[PDB]
Amino acid sequence: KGRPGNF
Amino acid sequence: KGRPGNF
Amino acid sequence: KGRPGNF
Amino acid sequence: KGRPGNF
Amino acid sequence: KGRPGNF
Amino acid sequence: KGRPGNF
Amino acid sequence: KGRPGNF
Amino acid sequence: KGRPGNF
Amino acid sequence: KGRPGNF
Amino acid sequence: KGRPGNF
Amino acid sequence: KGRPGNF
Amino acid sequence: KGRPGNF
Amino acid sequence: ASVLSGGELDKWEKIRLRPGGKKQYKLKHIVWASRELERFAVNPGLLETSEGCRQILGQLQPSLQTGSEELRSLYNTIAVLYCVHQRIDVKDTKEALDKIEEEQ
Amino acid sequence: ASVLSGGELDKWEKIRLRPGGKKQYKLKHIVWASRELERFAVNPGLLETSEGCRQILGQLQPSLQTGSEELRSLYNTIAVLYCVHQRIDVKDTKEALDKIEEEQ
Amino acid sequence: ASVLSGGELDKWEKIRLRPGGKKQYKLKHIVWASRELERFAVNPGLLETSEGCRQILGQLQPSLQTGSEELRSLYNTIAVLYCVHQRIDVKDTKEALDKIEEEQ
Amino acid sequence: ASVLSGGELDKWEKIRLRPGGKKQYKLKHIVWASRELERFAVNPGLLETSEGCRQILGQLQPSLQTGSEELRSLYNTIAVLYCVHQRIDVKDTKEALDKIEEEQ
Amino acid sequence: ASVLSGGELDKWEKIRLRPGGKKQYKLKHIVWASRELERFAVNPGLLETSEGCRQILGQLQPSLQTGSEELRSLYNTIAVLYCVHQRIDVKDTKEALDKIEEEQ
Amino acid sequence: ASVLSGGELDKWEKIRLRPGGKKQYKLKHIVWASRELERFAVNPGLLETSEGCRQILGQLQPSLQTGSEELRSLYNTIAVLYCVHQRIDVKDTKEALDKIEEEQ
Amino acid sequence: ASVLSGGELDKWEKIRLRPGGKKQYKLKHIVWASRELERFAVNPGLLETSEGCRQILGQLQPSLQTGSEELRSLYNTIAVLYCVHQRIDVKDTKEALDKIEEEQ
Amino acid sequence: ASVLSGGELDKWEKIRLRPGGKKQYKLKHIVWASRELERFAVNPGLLETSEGCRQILGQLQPSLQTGSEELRSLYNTIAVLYCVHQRIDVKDTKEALDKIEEEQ
Amino acid sequence: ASVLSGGELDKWEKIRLRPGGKKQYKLKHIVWASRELERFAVNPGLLETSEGCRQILGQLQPSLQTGSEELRSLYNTIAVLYCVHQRIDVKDTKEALDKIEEEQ
Amino acid sequence: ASVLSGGELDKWEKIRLRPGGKKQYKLKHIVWASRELERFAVNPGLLETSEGCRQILGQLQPSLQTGSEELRSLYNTIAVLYCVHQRIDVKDTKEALDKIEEEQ
Amino acid sequence: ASVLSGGELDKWEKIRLRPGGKKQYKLKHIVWASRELERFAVNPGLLETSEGCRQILGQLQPSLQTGSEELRSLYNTIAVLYCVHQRIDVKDTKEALDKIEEEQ
Amino acid sequence: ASVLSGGELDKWEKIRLRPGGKKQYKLKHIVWASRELERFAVNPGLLETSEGCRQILGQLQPSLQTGSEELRSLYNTIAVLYCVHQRIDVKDTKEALDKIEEEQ
């Protein structure tokens, strides 16, 4: 997908 | 002629 | 014509 | 679709 | 005719 | 041309 | 698309 | 033409 | 063209 | 000649 | 030459 | 030419 | 390009020439009047307004006392046309003339 | 259907056009005057009475100052015809004009 | 036998019909005016003097309010010819009319 | 996509170019005016409202004193179109100009 | 991995959609609600607790006034699911909504 | 099943997108707006009343500050449609926006 | 012989035409503006300095109220070019116009 | 149909373009000026009088500050032509401009 | 057309996703964030300025309490990008969030 | 062995001969000026310093009142070269002359 | 393109070079003087006016004390030409010089 | 026809060009000076007297400050020739210049 593991 | 008998 | 020399 | 007639 | 456009 | 004689 | 150039 | 959609 | 070098 | 049109 | 004997 | 080195 | 509308023409054709007479006015009498005004070098476009008719009458009036049959006929026709443009329900030329005289 | 009677015509033909002149008036000058009045749209029947002649003169008079040869000739002819209808024994047009001016 | 001299004609031809217009006056407009005055039975010889032009104007003036295109054209032409005979350096008919109105 | 409605166009076509003239206004004069405003880079859409006509007139007015025949013709046409949009029953361009001058 | 236990589901299936209606709620309505919350990008895991249901309702509420049929259906379904998690023995959606409104 | 009547549509098509522009509004812009409101899950039936348009505007307004081209286009279209339903004779989108801002 | 340096051009190309829009300015818009100023007979060499841009704007400004699309486009382009020569970090034409209006 | 007489043209041809220059004025410069005034839609007939030249100058003057080479050339040519019509014995364009500035 | 310069990108790639983690940020996370903002119909051009990032954060913030993994990831990415545009030497997302919270 | 550096030459070539003109200065004008000063037996090496340019100007100045085109051209060229050596950002010869006159 | 008119040339040719001499002035002496002034880089167009002759004399005068035969011949020729332009009926160069000295 | 006598020439040839130099003056330097004075249009016969040399020096002196190599060489040669005619036993050009400066 592309979303970061920010949280 | 065409004039009326107005008078 | 017919006019007189009146004047 | 699946939505209920709630309203 | 001959009349001017004066007016 | 088309312009009127307005003036 | 269809959107107007409103803005 | 070339004019921008500025306005 | 025809314009003078006035200026 | 070469002189400019300065004046 | 052309100059006058003025003086 | 002929000019002196005066200066 | 008649001077009158169809409704004012339908008024006009009813008006009778003489107070007790059988003879009605007709459109040709307006046509003749418009064709006669250019003999006097009056502007025929004034026939289209009540103010223009009043002005033509005011210009013709001093010539009536010695005026020919054609001038009297033109004056009476323009008086009636003035009354039609005022939409006064005059029935004859003498009514039209009295209506105009009352303004004096 | 002449304007004058035979007796007034026998007066008229004697009158001379110019005060010192040899030329007499003629009937054709009355005919011409009656034929000219319809150009001005004046009622030619007024020529038959002294009052009608006075009225025609009063209507023509303001146009004299700039008037053409035809208008001056018509005015002078109607002045003389007025004097004939008054049965004034004028001998020339200048007498006729003085006779009318005296009334003013 | 033109009304104007060659010098006053050389003034006349310069004058333009309308204040902003391109069209000049021409000699034929004087010819037409002289040929039109005999319809009104005005004496055309008055066109030769500034006083005669003033008199013709004074006689035509009351007919302007209802006057036809021909009467308005004749009045404006005779106004300009009056200004030329006064040798006023008017440039257009509206200048000529203002110059004459100032005298009133 | 004419500027006028059919009713205001039926008013417009009646109006005459000169106060005593025979020549009427026509639709092509509106077309020409709309085609001329884009030379001055004025927005031709302002011709559709009485306020827009008043604004165009206010912008053209200072150029009249030295203005060419085309600018004077355009100014007078837009004055008449302003009067038509105000639905003032003006009969000629001079009436239209007086009506607008009265507002000043 | 249903949101409800078998006992609360046996409560849920009894509840009827409209106060006088014959139609019961079904499990698929919970499935649809959980599948719809991800369109609004709301966290679907909040459906598992009464506090989460209260939070989803508090976030959806201001959109109801103009809300589509899908938003109103989702709001009413989550209101009923909140009442089931509170184990309030509501019998219909209007009871569920009144129960929640009483808290305000 | 258009949102507008034929008369209000004949008003709508005249309105131009930009205050000085040549481009008019079209029916397809209303169709697009009605098709876009269902992305935001706003009830498209509110477009049929002036109160509904005011409500949609009040809901879209806080998203304008950061809003995309599509949201700004939808907001301006619904502002103009509100003005058409109020039958305010606005001529452009900036007039429509000023008319709505005056209410605040 | 571009009006801008490569650094100011690299600023210019970033600026977007409308505050929320996707469309950037391009060099051809400066070329068009320089080619349009010679229609108004404005000196195109003034585009090279911030003072010259301020002077062109001061001369174009009174024509905006009725100005065509081309005049409004030229005014907005020269406003943005003035802001680039002042090296104000404006992001859109409305920012550029507000920056210039603040000076008044 | 030259603007100048042969005597004023014999003055004109002597005047030099620049105060120290060798180049004289020529008739073609008047022809060009008369052909250029119709681009600005100024009435070219005003070139024929000293008052008209003063009026054209008063209309061109506010455009000089940003004016193109063609506008500055036209302004200076019309200044010199004004001085020739005043028959001031100016020798160059700078003398002509000083003579006109002294009037302010 | 990346949002960051090469120098700010060389800062960005150093920042680690979690305070103790091994995983760095990458350019694709900015690409994904710019591609995700158009789902919320937020203007993606605001990512280019620190003020735009602050505005996007202020608009996303009230949705965090119930926000999905994608909304929390987008909020944290835009917080870090705001810190990079402020050129604050933050080392992780929790530092970035504390830096932004300190402003409140 | 040019008088100017490449940077001051890149200033010089931009300067235009006449305040509104299209024609730029060129290097050949400096070459011609340096070749002309040896006719007057002035030391051409003074062109290399601002003080030398001021001295040449002070020596040429009293000959200007009657000076030929070549002397006026040389004086104006050396004035501009003085301004370039002072690195004053003059745009034309008249600016250069005003800048020098202000020192008096 | 002689400096003198034919009448002033007919004065000039009478003047004799020396007070008691037989030798007259000739046109070629004016031609030579005009061809010599360009050696001194004086503007030869000043020979056309009495003020220009006075200015040339005022510029040549300080060089007389040590002046060559050519400078003295040019000074005396321009003195006589000044007297001819003043139309003073001088008969010889010594008269011309006394006439000019009297002005000091 | 040398300027000097054989005795003063036998003085002249001894004088050295520079105060410490080996190079003597020569007759050709006087010949060159006499041939150069006619470029400046100075009367070369003044070289024959001490008063004439003083006058030539007084005329050349103001041109020295900017003077070319040829003018400085001519001035120094005529200074030395003045000292020879005064029969001052100067040994070099600097002595000659000091001797002349002492007179000031």
Author numbering:
A (entry chain L), B (entry chain T), C (entry chain V), D (entry chain H), E (entry chain X), F (entry chain D), ...: 10 to 16
M (entry chain S), N (entry chain U), O (entry chain W), P (entry chain C), Q (entry chain G), R (entry chain I), ...: 5 to 108
Study authors write:
In the resulting model, bound SP2 adopted a largely extended conformation, with G11 at the top close to the viral membrane, and the C-terminal F16 at the base. The peptide is held in place by multiple interactions, including π-stacking between the backbone amides of SP2 R12 and P13 with MA W36 and H33, respectively, and a salt bridge between SP2 R12 and MA E73.
Here we show that released spacer peptide 2 (SP2), a conserved peptide of unknown function situated about 300 residues downstream of MA, binds MA to induce structural maturation.
